[PDB]
């Protein structure tokens, strides 16, 4: 019970491929839009890359990496290493490491900071260190 | 072209001598109009057995539709060119 | 040695553009799928936006921002500011700040918490604070 | 003032749909590339999934989840729960929880670690715990 | 086919008897070439009123271009097949 259209008006391709209830529509308009639609999925494989730029803001995929980048920011989903960047405030998630590095760290809560450690802690410091009770 | 003489065509036949006959003229058609030439201006062809085609240029008072259609059972292909809309491809069932 | 097909069956467009070994296939089926394929890449630029919705779950790209959002969750890759949200558990990655804010924080390890600080620490607190050795 | 092309050379589909200044170009080359372009956006909805694979590196979208996965790494933007994984270094961002779990944690800074807590802290430990002033 | 006799066609007419006349031959055209058959080799048709079509096979020394064109006001559809380039679809205005 299907229907299948394939147009070229002034506006552009107005493809829609419809079953009785389902459908998939794809426009490539002249006003500068691309509208894909479906009723289950849009699956799109490759073999090396997928790069989606809007003026120096990537989302790129390789065999190993997944960049989520702009200027002054990046998330690397590298293999066995996550790097999250603002300059300068890093969080590096390695195999057996969470390095949480910046110039200044603020930590708030409302209830607890329930720290445990299966071996010794080494809180190094300098000039001052305070507490309250 | 190769358009052979199908059946249900009606034809003038000379007999030029004893055991000599020929074929001259064609008195039939299969694709015509049935309207008053103010509503449609057909220029078309039917093709093949069952005549399940068209190559028509139908010019009404609102459009000028080129067509390369087929009318099968459970399948309706086409190729349409309007003036207002534009180049079409269609499957229907 | 190429081959180029462009179909309209009952199923839909079954485009595949093939060289001798390479190829790119695009389906727009009637069962509700879109299948893009390639042998190197799918590069897709724009000039303002890229918005990919599946029922209130965005991945949007602007000149500056990269949202990774659903209901009750969001990652902003804003320019010089990363904001990661669950209500209510924030991690804000500014230029010289890692604020790590919630109502409750748990911290486990297995080996160490090797804290250093190039100037003074100020561990404020309230009613109790314990240790062990 | 539009122009509309639809080709099939040896290279492949070289569609470009142009207004006087705007435009949208889509290639499906024979050398293995797919190049989408626009001057405003590429909006692409669905109803169940969007899956983009390049050899075991997903970015998948469901009604609730957003996976950002490879081998040995994953970010779940699950509903009310963010899970960030390297084996073994977890950060789980729940509703009222930031569990920051690994085998070893390093924490550097340059200025401060300005910890506050609206109730009691419980720093548990084992064999050693040091300081400096 | 159905291609009726439009106006501005010029035609031989017999008068076979009193109050009997017929139509035999065609002395006119509307789609021809104007070049020396070394630069273009036209094989085409015009269609409909205003003759705003073509089904041409223009063979120059550089290409062999099939065409299914229309020339309206503010709309220019086509369907082009070259030898070097390939299958085209075009809208122009």
Question: Can you walk through the features of this model?
Answer:
The structure is cut from a larger assembly and holds three copies of chain A (133 residues) and two copies of chain B (93 residues). Chain A has 133 residues and is mostly beta strands. Chain A is 0% helix and 49% strand. Chain A is built from no helices and 15 strands. Chain A has strands at 3-5, 12-18, 24-29, 34-36, 41-44, 50-51, 59-61, 66-70, 73-78, 81-86, 89-93, 98-102, 104-107, 112-115, 122-123. In chain A, strands 6-7-8-9-10-11-12 form a seven-stranded antiparallel β-sheet, with no helix packed on it. Chain A is elongated, with a radius of gyration of 25 Å. Chain B has 93 residues and is mainly beta. Helices cover 0% and strands 41% of the residues of chain B. Chain B has no helices and six strands. Chain B has strands at 11-17, 20-26, 54-59, 64-69, 76-81, 87-92. In chain B, the strands form two sheets. In chain B, strands 3-4-5-6 form a four-stranded antiparallel β-sheet, with no helix packed on it. Chain B has a two-stranded antiparallel sheet with strand order 1-2. In chain B, a hairpin with a 6-residue loop joins β4 (64-69) and β5. The two termini of chain B are 32 Å apart. The chains are: A mainly beta (133), B mainly beta (93).
Question: How are the SSEs placed, and which strands pair?
Answer:
The structure is cut from a larger assembly and holds three copies of chain A (133 residues) and two copies of chain B (93 residues).
Chain A: E1 3-5, E2 12-18, E3 24-29, E4 34-36, E5 41-44, E6 50-51, E7 59-61, E8 66-70, E9 73-78, E10 81-86, E11 89-93, E12 98-102, E13 104-107, E14 112-115, E15 122-123
Antiparallel strand pairs in A: 1-2, 2-3, 3-4, 6-7, 7-8, 8-9, 9-10, 10-11, 11-12
Chain B: E1 11-17, E2 20-26, E3 54-59, E4 64-69, E5 76-81, E6 87-92
PDB class: transport protein
Keywords: T6SS Central Spike, Complex, transport protein
Entry title: Structure of Francisella PdpA-VgrG Complex, half-lidded
């Amino acid at each position: 019970k299907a229907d299948h259209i394939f147009n070229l008006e002034e506006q552009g391709l107005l493809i829609d491929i419809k079953d009785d209830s389902k459908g998939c529509t794809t426009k490539l308009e002249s006003s500068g839009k691309i509208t894909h639609n479906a009723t289950e999925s849009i699956e799109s494989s490759a073999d090396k890359q997928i790069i989606e730029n809007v003026k120096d803001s990537k989302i790129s995929i390789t065999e190993k990496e997944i960049l989520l980048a702009t200027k002054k920011s990046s998330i690397m989903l590298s293999e066995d290493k996550i790097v999250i960047k603002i300059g300068n405030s890093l969080i590096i998630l390695d195999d057996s490491n969470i390095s949480l590095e910046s110039a200044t760290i603020n930590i708030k809560s409302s209830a607890n900071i329930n720290i445990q450690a299966s071996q010794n802690i080494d809180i190094k410091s300098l000039n001052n260190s305070i507490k309250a009770d | 072209q190769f358009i052979p003489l199908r059946n249900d065509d009606i034809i003038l036949i000379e007999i030029q001598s004893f055991t000599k006959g020929e074929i001259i003229e064609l008195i039939s058609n299969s694709a015509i109009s049935t309207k008053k030439a103010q509503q449609q201006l057909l220029q078309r062809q039917l093709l093949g057995s069952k005549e399940n085609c068209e190559m028509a240029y139908t010019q009404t008072s609102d459009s000028e539709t080129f067509s390369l259609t087929q009318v099968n059972e459970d399948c309706e292909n086409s190729f349409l060119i309007n003036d207002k809309k534009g180049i079409f491809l269609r499957y229907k069932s």
